[PDB]
Design a protein around this ligand. Structure first.
Ligand SMILES: Nc1ncnc2c1ncn2[C@@H]1O[C@H](COP(=O)(O)OP(=O)(O)O)[C@@H](O)[C@H]1O
Ligand SMILES: Nc1ncnc2c1ncn2[C@@H]1O[C@H](COP(=O)(O)OP(=O)(O)O)[C@@H](O)[C@H]1O
Ligand SMILES: CN(CC(=O)O)C(N)N
Ligand SMILES: [Mg+2]
Ligand SMILES: [Mg+2]
Lengths: 370, 374
């Protein structure tokens, strides 16, 4: 620290990123000497943002949390970043958590002729343990054990087994990856620069019930990545299992003195500020050859508050007209609200694909902006 | 460290069961237990040191060290780990041994003859660290910028054959950068698994750059794997001319920094201190790009390499494969010999490999040419 704040201030002149848009010399001056209980610092928080400039078109977050205290100790940086990334979400705003699956209306009849799969995923962090960008091998192992012992008490349809990555051949791994069940080794320079790939494979693995309809990714982007999924369109069932399983897992952890990080302002606390509130991304793999090329496709996603992406075959990668359409919201909307927008929006897109196949217009179906 | 202290040495001890790297061969639980709570004046810890070796269990083309130093004192404070690592990687260099420099080109015998039909290029490089500034795996942006400043000012005073300009990576277009890379002058994109896992890629390209003369025969990499990497190179096999330019420019550089009150990290035992333990001592890696279609496929290629103490790398550097049968052959050990003795080894070994390729072209035996393990 024999160097001034200005001498140590990152060169962000060519950066396109939330962290870069928020950070100023004053904030750096005031916070560069602070640290969280686990020793995480502002430099640690912004490192990924300094290394990954991102692109003008897409705006990346550019910063991560190394532990729970980061969001309070470095609020001068996270607050404006969160506000900007989350659409105006203010430090005083509160986030509503709703995991009551009975509040969802319909969603069990999505067209199986267009909707090949349905999936609802979220992330969780364990109180008292540093997050992936900063967690020690010991901490990571602690989380792993907690899941192993905790999940081993799940019964019935939630009866399952844990497979540490170290127990799977590179071949078995690829198969699990190809079938959309398992996460691969991080490659994203955004991820790698945060330090979350450390000691990789150690402490990582996957737990899943026998039917592989309920899964828990262990120590990948976050402490826990809980997933519920099936082929088809009953999203209702998917969410149902999601909520029931989630609650079973929370009850066990809470009982073990290790609960999930949460607060009334950010909801569930996770590594990346973009995934705060709910750690939820509910979506379907759907075939929309006509719609994906319709001039209005971009406007419908915006109005339905949905997002698109790519994983082409429910098996195969980058083929066909099979898209991954999911909710865009994270914080400010409740789990039920997000999955409800997925159900409604996906149902409308299907209704649109069909019209487009018949060469008819879709102006008739254009939703209103949500 | 106070936070990890909440966990036992065993809970934090890395699983190196499937690892190959010098760090893994040496690191024991006892050593981890005793050093896990230490730190250097700049804040570097045992975990920081070994991180690259825990992340990188192997390497596609060579045997790696698997640890790095974040500052000068790492080698002393974490002696228990670096000492056997150093003895393993450099053959048998003992912690009680002392390093000796020789920069005097005159002591180099021959080497101005390399069969130009086989040796496409000759190069001699070394690294230097600046006293009082943390090493790349751990340096702050302010520290990195101070190194760049010292280099710009310091190197700007060279003249004539060494007159040069400094080009910061940020002043270079992506195309200019890749040209410099394709031409083997500039360090590659930050892609080396070591550079990445050790934290040496932080804030890239901020503070990085290359300085060189108009002829591009004498260059200095600024802030890459080390503060400075001083290079001398040219197409062809006149290994002696390369080394002369090497010693002369380097000696000049060292005097300029000394005069500016900036000296380089040096100790009686490890010689020149650099990031990777493999680069300590002379920090010199002298070699050539040679075309050995036959020998490289011969079942005794690896053995010839070991007996001669030479290391093979790809045509585009340690992180690449050999292309068009063109291998980067250089001295593999840097502690235990001087720059003259090491450069003499590449010279002798390469001539012998040429002679070896000639045998094989004629379908001859090379068994008689296999020298005793030096
Ligand atoms: N609706 C879905 N149905 C089946 N598999 C899916 C679905 N959505 C995502 N996946 C799979 O999950 C894996 C991770 O995809 P990715 O976009 O990173 O997802 P996430 O961020 O939600 O974890 C991939 O194998 C992907 O194909
Ligand atoms: N003998 C040589 N002649 C020309 N270029 C070389 C030679 N040896 C190595 N290089 C080049 O130097 C660059 C750095 O390669 P690397 O293995 O990382 O070396 P170093 O040990 O100097 O860091 C590469 O572009 C490589 O092709
Ligand atoms: C390839 N290296 C040696 C090693 O990894 O052992 C470098 N760059 N220090
Ligand atoms: Mg993912
Ligand atoms: Mg190199």
């Amino acid at each position: 620290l024999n160097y001034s704040a200005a001498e140590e201030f990152p060169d962000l002149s060519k950066h396109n990123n939330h962290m870069a848009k928020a950070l100023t010399l004053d904030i750096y001056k005031k916070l560069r000497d602070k640290e969280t209980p686990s020793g995480f610092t502002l430099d640690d928080i912004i490192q990924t943002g300094v290394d990954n400039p991102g692109h003008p078109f897409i705006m990346t977050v550019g910063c991560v949390a190394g532990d729970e205290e980061c969001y309070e100790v470095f609020k001068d940086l996270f607050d404006p970043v969160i506000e900007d990334r989350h659409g105006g979400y203010k430090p005083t705003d509160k986030h509503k958590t709703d995991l009551n699956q009975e509040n969802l209306k319909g969603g069990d009849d999505l067209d199986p002729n267009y909707v090949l799969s349905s999936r609802v995923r979220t992330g969780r962090s364990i109180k008292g343990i540093a997050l992936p960008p900063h967690c020690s091998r010991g901490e990571r192992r602690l989380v792993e054990k907690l899941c192993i012992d905790g999940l081993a008490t799940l019964t019935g349809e939630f009866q399952g087994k844990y497979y540490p990555l170290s127990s799977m051949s590179d071949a078995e791994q690829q198969q699990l990856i190809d079938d959309h069940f398992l996460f691969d080794k991080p490659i994203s320079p955004l991820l790698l620069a945060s330090g979350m790939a450390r000691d990789w494979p150690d402490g990582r693995g996957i737990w899943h019930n026998n039917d592989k309809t309920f899964l828990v990714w262990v120590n990948e982007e976050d402490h826990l990545r809980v997933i519920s999924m099936q082929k088809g369109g009953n999203m209702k069932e998917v969410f149902r299992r999601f909520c029931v399983g989630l609650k079973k897992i929370e009850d066990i952890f809470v009982k073990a003195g290790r609960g999930f990080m949460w607060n009334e302002h950010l909801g569930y606390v996770l590594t990346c500020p973009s995934n705060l509130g709910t750690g939820l991304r509910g979506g379907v793999h759907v075939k929309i050859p006509h719609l994906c090329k319709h001039e209005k496709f971009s406007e419908v996603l915006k109005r339905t508050r949905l997002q698109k992406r790519g994983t082409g075959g429910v098996d195969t990668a980058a083929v066909g007209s099979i898209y991954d359409i999911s909710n865009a919201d994270r914080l400010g909307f409740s789990e039920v609200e997000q999955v409800q927008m997925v159900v409604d929006g996906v149902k409308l897109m299907v209704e649109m694909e069909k019209r487009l196949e018949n060469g008819k217009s879709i102006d008739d179906l254009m939703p209103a902006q949500k």
